[PDB]
Symmetry: C3
Subunit: 544 residues, 3 copies
């Protein structure tokens, strides 16, 4: 006989139960989460010795909702679920994003987080239930993983924050955000609100982070109770011999390379510097490990950008911190469509179109919690010609779907109700070129496309992404980040809203140690830039 | 003018016609086997040149069912037969399973045996017609094949046997099995029975094997008449200079490596030896093939386990040759689903669920013969976290479909009729951990899920797997085999049924020379092992 | 801030507008094309450096129609276009085919042509608009391209040729062809014509070629205005010391290798020479490249065949310049289906079947501009066993859909109306062996299958493909070419029709400098071979 080890704790209005060490033993980690009646079984499998020819951390999270959870036989032709829907893909991204940055730098081992829904209650979502599982299992696995993260859902009724609102409570609620992060700092946040202000939008993030602290403490006690011992992993020793040998040839040229304004001219230049430096090092001796060099050159690229921002020197394209790129607004680009828009910011632009139809063309979503019909439709396409390369095209990938739901949340608060406008609207965003924010601009393109179409929107809506360069305690907040300022930066602080308030913001932080004090600066500077986008948008069109 | 080579012979109540030499002359083999209204054109293509590193034998069988065989336009959006359905995959396995062990060891050349149905009779099933088709083609191809095999459906009407029962006669029949084997011995068997005794179930396998002998004789005469010259292929010359060089270094390590008992600790130890023995030989001589060294180590692994079980000595986990693994019967493990079950046998586990629905949720099967509705549903999911590896959560592999119907056949005889219980039942089996037989454990969890849901089944149903190790003429029968035992053994003898009779039986023999005398011993020992599972199941629940 | 470069002109009636320099700046080239209201946004991306291990030229043209162009929400389940349809792949091939031979010999850099429909007029067809867009983008990119090409649709109303007919004007027309080619010579060509004569079909190609000249002139002027400078590219230099080194060892017996008749004996002989020549050259020195030696051997294979045909020597299988291979006509090959046919030409055969149905079984094509329901279906299947190789079977390949419609082009014109025959007919072609033209042999098998089914077709239809060997100004026209005479040849000239007129005409030229006189001779010589097949076809069956 095998007996499981359990621990029960009160969380909000529901009693969350965690179980381990009875179901999957062959898997490195296995926990079964049960908020109140909704259960999600999460397993984490990680290899001890991965491949040697790996340069990227290969983490994959597969979220899947079982049909027997609600107690219904699937409506598919084969009577068996198959491909994940738009709902299941968004939750998969909601679990990956917070857990990714907690892994130590230099960890290249393949890990897979399989989260399957067991049972479901029509009141409690299982999003946040699955996020606790990936937080509990990964801490019990032994795999080097900081945290663990807490999962919290924030509501807003009567100008006051409510922890974990049900489906019936969400009908009267104004704000709907999911907050995740470690005990020390916040890590992500996915929001969907009405038109709240800047102060109350930040207060909900702090509220949820304080409430999720109960979950974090209960997992930590379970690690010392049933958790497997930590992996004996050590990062590759910092070779000071090569870090001065490569830098004496590359750091001098790469410092001058990051002053070019054009993206095409800069990326072609840094590729040449990376090519001939390795070519010379291979000509010296064939012992030097190729990849190794690729990470040293990448470390120099990170050091050149970050140090110049902290000192007070001009950015890549030679732009101050609170300064943004130039704007180009074009309404009515297509001839035989309902609505069309061409919004351009610097060197990134989105061809956004709007379509109108009857209520019969509504998307009938067969969700696990309940069957609902979606009136407003938003689609995000990211073709390879935007970044300037070749790739596969046909079916939308993870992001494509994630950024599409993001741009939907930023407009959903503005969109008129069915009582005034009873027509199904489909908005398609086509990324023509991409350098900084592609999900954001869109929201700017959607507002121009919906007016042009004839949709009576409440107020013009815009949005821009923010960044951060943090080293020690001091920090610099960036307005309208570039491609090199996001991949080498510390966070992708996306904010979208109207003239009055904020519709929806996405918080993606890569480092731990983020504070509420530096959150206010990033929130306030985004509002000043948001009004600047709208000042040019209202210059072209101001009425539907 | 083109000319065909025709052979006709009487087989039961049907006449079988074999044509070769005119259709698909470019392919190594092409045989047109069409009985009384219906046929399955089968072609074999084998590459003369083997891969560069190819180690395993790549055999791929694609069985597809054209809709114009019955004379009907397919009911789809594209109006064309696309990817194979649940049915098409099953027959493909009935073609792939008997032919695979007949290919000689050391043969790594890629071969493809595809079968396409070109016309069809509502009374004669295309499954055995395709099996004879592949048997005739592979023998006429020239590719090293130790066949040919015969195909026969046995059935059971009025305490008697009838060779290849028709679709109308199958409704009155209490048995439905397809037997495949050579002139010397049996090789496979896929069966479905309505609670039959061991003597009647064993006598059915012998009956079908004796009746299919005329098929083998008629194929052999065609090979002597219109057969392509056999391939000049010889296995790698076995040298004792390299074998004893590894055996004096690895056999001592591998002997203690199979005494570890625990799966995770055994596989970790057995991988270390493989990773070190090859590495130490490469340090001494780097001109040796790594691919050859792994095949020798696999032969040593085969010699250690088989010799220990051949003599009176406990196996890899400490069990005797009839002793079965420990049991953990659990039900009502999940809250918000109709039926819950948790079955664990030693180191294998299956989370089985039950779901109830109306006649609206019935599976509408669009088969080649005609449209029918399926009331009982069974799905088999095999995730990567079961064995402790990383894979694509995606699905569903073939083995997943083949084992899905396997467990469906074991419960179908137990399941109540439509009149007494007019509800469509959906059963989903989730493999939590895998070691030994997980398909037989799915049948044990199925009965527990149905009783928890409230489904009034006839009796309790259970299932176990049996193994064999034979060297010369003497044999040792194993009860409830482990994973490896299945790979390093000789046969996968699966038996599923109740206390009274057998509901399902699968016979997957990988070696020829199997005796009728040893089959009645393995089936009788399986009955005693099945009653042990059923006794513990009745302890937790004996009625719904 | 952002300025476009625009040039608009006239092309018969609808004014064609071309725009570049604003949309998609990151990519290599992006041109906004359109006529009246139909707009197709085409992008071309070319990679600077080639992949180390490349031997072939990777051209991947993908055409995607988006439903917001017409102003309609898609009728799909997810409400997203996604994967390319049956129609979308045909236009993708219609763009890929003419542009492929224009790339210089030796160029191996990966290029992608992404053409997407963004706006559409219900009268103007996007297919010719997308072809102009790709022609403009490839010329403005700088990537080595020997264009530009023009696109013209030719109709035939009241014995007169009409340039670019609208969808309403096509109902009166008896011809619908899409002609493509450079300023000096024609390239590809696909037609469909209710039994028209040779001079009518030939004159229509010349008509469209002369009318599309104004398009090419306006593209060339735009390149002179705002075109990115031509790529600094130079092909691999001719190795005089290596080309003679291989020839003095391989060319001697490779000349005798293309002398034997049988395909299986020839392809085994040309492979065994290559397997021995390269093995000896690698043993002599290991500094040589694997792919470089194969390119010289292929040049020998090309030179041996072409030199014999041009001089006046007998062909590979011992045929004359106008001689057609042996024919085998069989019908009623299958028992339990409506239509059955087994047509064989030389060593190529197609198992063609005809299936009868009702109006309920008709395919509803959700095309961009249109709601038409197709009553006639044609499906082409090219399995791996036809060529004697091993591959993967699943979703119909681009080559299968292209030949499927191409075989449909010849049958649709001769088929009876819905008023006299109100049954939906499905035709499925199965290629069992292939060497010459299996797509045109499917048309011959289609007429035999329909007569066996009972379809009252107006006349019998047959056809063959034509080849040409031209290196100077003198030419040799070949009737019914092989696989070796098509790859090493210069053009693929497909003709299909009845005893009175031509139903289908396809033109696939790989070389520049095609004259008017060689196009009519290849068409007139095809008529003689077409009458030969129909004469043998009438011997078996003449009336249903």
């Amino acid at each position: 006989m095998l007996n499981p080890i359990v621990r029960k704790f009160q969380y909000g209005q529901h009693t969350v139960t965690l179980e381990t060490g009875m179901m999957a033993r062959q898997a490195t980690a296995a926990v079964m989460v049960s908020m109140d009646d909704t259960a999600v079984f999460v397993t984490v499998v990680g290899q001890k010795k991965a491949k040697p020819g790996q340069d990227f951390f290969p983490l994959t999270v597969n979220y899947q909702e079982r049909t027997y959870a609600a107690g219904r036989i699937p409506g598919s032709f084969f009577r068996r679920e198959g491909r994940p829907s738009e709902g299941e893909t968004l939750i998969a991204r909601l679990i990956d994003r917070p857990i990714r940055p907690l892994f130590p730098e230099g960890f290249v081992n393949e890990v897979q987080v399989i989260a399957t829904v067991v049972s479901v209650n029509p009141q409690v979502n299982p999003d946040i239930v699955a996020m606790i599982g990936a937080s509990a299992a990964l801490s019990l696995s032994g795999i080097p993983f900081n945290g663990p993260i807490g999962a919290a859902r924030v509501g807003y009724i009567n100008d006051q924050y409510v922890l974990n609102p049900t489906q019936d409570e969400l009908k009267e609620s104004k704000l709907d955000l999911v907050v995740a992060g470690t005990e020390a700092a916040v890590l992500m946040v996915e929001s969907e609100a009405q038109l709240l202000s800047e102060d109350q939008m930040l207060g909900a993030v702090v509220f949820g982070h304080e409430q999720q602290q109960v979950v974090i403490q209960n997992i930590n006690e379970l690690v010392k109770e049933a958790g497997k011992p930590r992996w004996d992993w050590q990062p590759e020793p910092v070779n000071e011999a090569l870090n001065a040998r490569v830098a004496a040839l590359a750091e001098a040229r790469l410092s001058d390379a990051y002053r070019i304004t054009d993206k095409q001219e800069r990326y072609a230049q840094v590729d040449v510097i990376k090519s001939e430096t390795i070519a010379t090092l291979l000509a010296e001796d064939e012992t030097l490990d190729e990849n190794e060099l690729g990470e040293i050159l990448h470390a120099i690229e990170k050091n050149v950008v970050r140090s110049r921002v902290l000192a007070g020197e001009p950015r890549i394209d030679g732009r101050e911190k609170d300064m943004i790129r130039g704007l180009d607004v074009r309404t009515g680009v297509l001839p035989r469509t309902h609505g069309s828009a061409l919004f351009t910011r610097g060197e990134t632009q989105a061809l956004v179109t709007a379509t109108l139809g009857t209520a019969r063309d509504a998307q009938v979503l067969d969700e696990l919690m309940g069957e609902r019909t979606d009136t407003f439709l938003f689609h995000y396409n990211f073709p390879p010609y935007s970044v300037g390369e070749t790739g596969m095209v046909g079916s939308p990938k993870r992001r494509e779907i994630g950024h599409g739901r993001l741009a939907k949340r930023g407009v959903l608060a503005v969109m008129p109700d069915m009582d005034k406008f009873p027509y199904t609207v489909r908005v398609v965003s086509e990324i023509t070129e991409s350098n900084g924010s592609s999900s954001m601009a869109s929201v700017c393109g959607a507002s121009l496309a919906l007016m042009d179409a004839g949709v009576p929107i409440k107020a013009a809506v815009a949005g821009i992404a923010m960044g951060l360069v943090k080293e020690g305690d001091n920090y610099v907040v960036l307005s309208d980040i570039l491609g090199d300022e996001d991949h080498l930066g510390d966070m992708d602080f996306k904010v979208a809203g109207s003239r009055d308030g904020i519709s929806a913001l996405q918080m993606d932080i890569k480092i731990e140690g983020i504070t509420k004090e530096i959150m206010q600066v990033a929130l306030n500077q985004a509002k000043g830039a948001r009004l600047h986008i709208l000042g040019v948008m209202e210059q072209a069109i101001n009425a539907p």
